[PDB]
Write a protein that binds this ligand. Structure first.
Ligand SMILES: [Mg+2]
Ligand SMILES: [Mg+2]
Ligand SMILES: [Mg+2]
Ligand SMILES: [Mg+2]
Ligand SMILES: [Mg+2]
Ligand SMILES: [Mg+2]
Lengths: 175, 138, 199, 190
RNA sequence: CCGCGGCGGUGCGCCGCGACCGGCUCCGGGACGGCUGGGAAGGCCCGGCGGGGAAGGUGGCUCGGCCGAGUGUUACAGCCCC
RNA sequence: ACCGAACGCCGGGUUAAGGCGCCCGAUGCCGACGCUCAUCAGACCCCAGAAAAGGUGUUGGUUGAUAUAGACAGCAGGACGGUGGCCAUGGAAGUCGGAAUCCGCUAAGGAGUGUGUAACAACUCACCUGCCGAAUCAACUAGCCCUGAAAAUGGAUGGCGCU
RNA sequence: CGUUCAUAGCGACGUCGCUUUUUGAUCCUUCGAUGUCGGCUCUUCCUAUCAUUGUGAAGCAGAAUUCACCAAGCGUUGGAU
RNA sequence: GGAGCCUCGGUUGGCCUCGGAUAGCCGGUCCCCCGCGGGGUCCGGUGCGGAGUGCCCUUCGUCCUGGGAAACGGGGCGCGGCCGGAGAGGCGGCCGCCCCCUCGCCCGUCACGCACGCCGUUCGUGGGGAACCUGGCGCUAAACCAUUCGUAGACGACCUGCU
């Protein structure tokens, strides 16, 4: 796995039928990935671990992108992880605040790279669950839960440093 | 010593982006560095938008932090923000700057001719004022 | 046809980078008030870093070996020299365009002088970060003429304050003049704000 | 992480009048002025209330080491106010097992000669920081009094005479001598 | 010899254009399909049904001129949200 | 000798592996999100350099607590008796050591954390209040940074530099 | 161990390192030759600091001291075999 | 003032506050203090900066005549006096007198090789350097050798002496 910005995918698949097992059970997952191609691969990786079931032994039935049903709501997402350290493998519960699951998992993948130099292929996302104002354990999230939120944008450092590469005016950063 | 604030209901002028040169109300703050934003009257769809691109006006129209777009449309049209914005000195010197860009070659020539004269008149009147100021000093 | 850049408030290498490319494209540049250049990283940090550079000498005959210039102008010149192909003819030609000064002397003390905002400290550094004035640095590594350069610049700032006061005085009269005249420049002043100035 | 906002208040008393040119508090009252600059602390020194009753210090989007300054600015203004009103009085008692550290102030407070420390021929001359004024007290035998408005300057000048009187190349557990700060009080209590 | 008529090869030297084809790299327009026969949205509003933040509210306190502003509590809907 | 790619002589196009402050072709993107300041910073296969073990440096986790029966620290009040308990006498009545190791009063104090004593004494280390006024605290874990970290001509993230 | 006290100074059983002023491994370079030990003489560097400056430690009362830090500026000699 | 080799780059100017950045810019002070200014308070304006380098200044065909608005401005490398400028000043400013002109903005009114579609045009330029013809006012050599000396010396060099 690598990235870009992910998309939730639904992928349901089954170990393909036999004489002995005529109508085998379907297994569904939530597989975040940049595209269906790697989605299906990612589906197979997770299933292999859990169930005696390989890409040869099975058929993916329905892979399909899943759309955030409330895009223009701001939400808080709890996300449970399973990363690999340099040392042992771990569990976490991260929390992000975003407009989407995909966005919230994407956000996670960047954080984990930042905070733990953890690369995609090490991380397992288990559950991603949207959450209330309460049931938010992280204070970095909790500070934005407030009705009359109010802050300034204090030392507003400029970009467009090469529109006028040279100029008479020393700039301004108070607004 | 701050005067403008990322408040809910603050109107912000978008400096750049897809929606560059458009007003936009801050519906809700998502993050350290991202605001859920709307500009119903100003042709800007409800979307998250980073602060880096928005620079914020002196207009806080009052609605509740996650109303459903209809209500901000009312609070915009009640306050008549489009009228008030175009009245501002800021928006005038935006309008100016655009009209300087639109300038055609004949229009550029007219201007030069108009300035050539208009700066001559003033220049003399300044010189007269200096002589009068020198006469007062004497 | 010539850049004059007030090196105050800039960052040593950050400015030097930009100056090099200007200089390589045939732009004649002047860099003024070089003592005011300021280098990221806390003072002590940079002193050691210089003091190390001092240690570098050709053991058998120091007289040959890397000439450690003290003056902030020459320091800044040294760092710009490090970003040109200065062993070439074209590189040597490039430096000959660049003209550096501790403080701001008589041709350029009555010239408006630019500021590279992409090399500027207020922009490029976090406000909680520490930095050093290349003056102080120069002073402690052996620069002789800090105080002289200060005493000459107090004159200049006093001399300039006067010029500005007279400039202001004209601007003010000019603002008055327009108001005195604004019925016999009215259908000029109108046309200069249809095509979008004066607003 | 970046805390969306922090602040504090510094309730100035009705005797004192504080004023802030930007981020450069100047506090004046009974005893005198005390300016202090905080260009280097990065905060919003608002000043609010009719009768100018309280000094507020916001600090937006602070991380842990940036939010550590908020209180230390607030506190420095508190001391500044105390200095203006009451004024600081550090008292320091001389200690010896033999050679009775002979102290004598000179110009006004400025100088402090400290003769016969440990039977040394060297006479320590110690200047005071501008503002602070040493004076040899009465009602207590071996004891100095440093008074002044700017606490920083006082306590520094106290240290100056404390480290002056130091013992070299001896067992300092055995040799307990010198002029040590005994008490950090005020010129007037109210 | 004048025709620079018709055809053929050419130009002393330096130039430019034009249209045709090949191979590229860009730009601007438009018209369609499929999906959770897309998801969200908008607009009109009506009838209900609850839950939450937290309110034209009330209340302790504070700050300004009964009104405006800032915290705090129980929480219906006369701000909204689900 | 690595990675990319294998050469007739040339024009246009496009790539690879690598890059794009300046040297040096290309980010002079209004690039996105974090992390990190180092008086030895760090900066890219082969490769030209460090470990065990530490650090309330800062940032994340994990697990457990705690507390309105208003805590947590911060100061103030007591720390006993059954009892020279038993083994050990060389002295251990809590205290070089070790088997023990409970009851009373209890508000509550271990047959005792230490200081110190030949041995005591004396001192010191729960349970509870008084004040103050919301979170507090422990143990792990892993990121960057730091200690650990000493070589001889002056010196090398390639250089200049860079926060 | 240090009367007592793991850590002032030490430090077993274990363990992790650096160094190339020891000696080995090794044989890449030089066999149409790179003059093979020591001493003298002279310069320069390193620090893993004996002394000297400034300091923290002690089982530092003083004196004498070992332990450590900044640190290589300046020194570090005359002889008998 | 005339020719005449050569070396090239250029192809409007900008004649300036200080500085700040969790702030600044301008006014005006009714009022107060200092040396027309400087400092203060108070109030009024600006502040994604229009007293803006996203800027300003300047115009880019020539002439003619015959109206209007604007109108004493410009010139003669016009001429004399009084300044300011030393950091590498190298540039300005301000004052007398002589002669000449009517230039910016609109309109009328004609004409200028109109070189017959086609390239280095257009300036800084009286440029930098070398060699050559005119006027006015100025000038009137040192150096080195040789010789000498000995504060010096391998030799050069150096210190000295010589109507
Ligand atoms: Mg001693
Ligand atoms: Mg023992
Ligand atoms: Mg060998
Ligand atoms: Mg040899
Ligand atoms: Mg050492
Ligand atoms: Mg030309």
């Amino acid at each position: 796995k690598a990235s870009g910005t992910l998309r939730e995918y639904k992928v349901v698949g089954r170990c393909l039928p036999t004489p002995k097992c005529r109508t085998p059970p379907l297994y569904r997952m939530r597989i975040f990935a940049p595209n269906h191609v790697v989605a299906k691969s990612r589906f197979w990786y997770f299933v292999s671990q859990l169930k005696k079931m390989k890409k040869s032994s099975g058929e993916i039935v329905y892979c399909g992108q899943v759309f955030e049903k409330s895009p223009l709501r701001v939400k808080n997402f709890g996300i449970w992880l399973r990363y690999d350290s340099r040392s042992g493998t771990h569990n976490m519960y991260r929390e992000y605040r975003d407009l989407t699951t995909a966005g919230a998992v994407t956000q996670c993948y960047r954080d984990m790279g930042a905070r733990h130099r953890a690369r995609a292929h090490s991380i397992q996302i288990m559950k991603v669950e949207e959450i209330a104002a309460s049931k938010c354990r992280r204070p970095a999230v909790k500070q934005f839960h407030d009705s009359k939120i109010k802050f300034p944008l204090p030392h507003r450092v400029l970009r467009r440093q090469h529109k006028p590469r040279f100029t008479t005016k020393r700039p301004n950063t108070f607004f | 010593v701050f005067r403008r604030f990322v408040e809910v209901g603050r109107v912000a002028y978008v400096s750049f982006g897809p929606h560059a040169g458009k007003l936009v109300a801050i519906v809700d703050v998502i993050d350290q560095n991202r605001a859920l934003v709307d500009g119903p009257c100003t042709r800007v769809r409800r979307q998250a938008m980073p602060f880096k691109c928005m620079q914020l006006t002196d207009f806080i129209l009052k609605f509740p932090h996650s109303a459903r777009q209809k209500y901000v449309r009312k609070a915009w049209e009640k306050a008549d923000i489009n009228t008030k914005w175009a009245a501002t000195r800021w928006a005038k010197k935006i309008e100016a700057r655009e009209r300087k860009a639109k300038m055609t070659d004949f229009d550029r020539y007219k201007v030069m001719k108009a300035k050539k004269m208009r700066n001559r008149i003033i220049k003399n009147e300044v010189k007269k004022l200096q002589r009068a100021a020198l006469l007062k000093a004497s | 046809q010539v850049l004059v850049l007030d090196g105050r408030g800039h960052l040593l290498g950050r400015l030097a980078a930009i100056v090099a490319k200007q200089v390589l494209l045939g732009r004649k540049v002047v860099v003024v008030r070089c003592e005011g250049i300021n280098i990221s990283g806390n003072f002590y940090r940079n002193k050691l870093k210089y003091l190390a550079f001092l240690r570098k000498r050709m053991n058998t005959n120091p007289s040959r070996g890397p000439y450690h210039f003290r003056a902030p102008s020459r320091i800044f010149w040294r760092t710009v020299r490090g970003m040109l192909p200065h062993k070439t003819k074209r590189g040597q030609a490039a430096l000959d365009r660049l003209k550096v000064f501790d403080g701001i002397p008589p041709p350029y003390d009555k010239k408006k002088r630019m500021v590279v905002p992409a090399a500027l400290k207020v922009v490029r550094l976090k406000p909680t970060r520490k930095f050093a004035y290349l003056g102080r640095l120069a002073h402690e590594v052996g620069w002789k003429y800090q105080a002289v350069t200060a005493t000459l610049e107090e004159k200049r700032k006093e001399k300039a304050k006067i010029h500005y006061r007279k400039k202001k005085q004209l601007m003010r009269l000019r603002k008055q003049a327009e108001k005195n005249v604004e019925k016999k420049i009215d259908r000029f002043t109108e046309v200069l704000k249809t095509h979008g100035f004066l607003v | 992480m970046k805390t969306i906002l922090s602040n504090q208040t510094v309730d100035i008393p009705e005797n004192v009048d504080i004023s802030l040119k930007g981020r450069t508090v100047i506090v004046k009252g009974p005893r005198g002025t005390l300016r202090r600059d905080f260009n280097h602390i990065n905060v919003e020194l608002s000043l609010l209330g009719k009768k100018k009753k309280r000094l507020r210090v916001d600090k937006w989007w602070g991380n842990r080491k940036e939010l550590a300054t908020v209180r230390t600015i607030c506190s420095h203004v508190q001391n500044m106010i105390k200095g203006v009103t009451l004024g600081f009085r550090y008292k320091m008692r001389s200690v010896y097992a033999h050679f009775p550290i002979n102290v004598v102030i000179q110009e006004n407070g400025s100088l402090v000669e400290i003769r016969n420390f440990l039977g040394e021929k060297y006479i320590r001359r110690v200047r005071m920081r501008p503002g602070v004024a040493c004076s040899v007290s009465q009602a207590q035998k071996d004891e100095l009094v440093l008074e002044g408005n700017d606490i920083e300057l006082v306590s520094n000048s106290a240290a100056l005479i404390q480290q002056a009187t130091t013992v070299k190349n001896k067992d300092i557990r055995k040799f307990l001598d010198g002029i040590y700060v005994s008490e950090k009080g005020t010129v007037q209590q109210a």
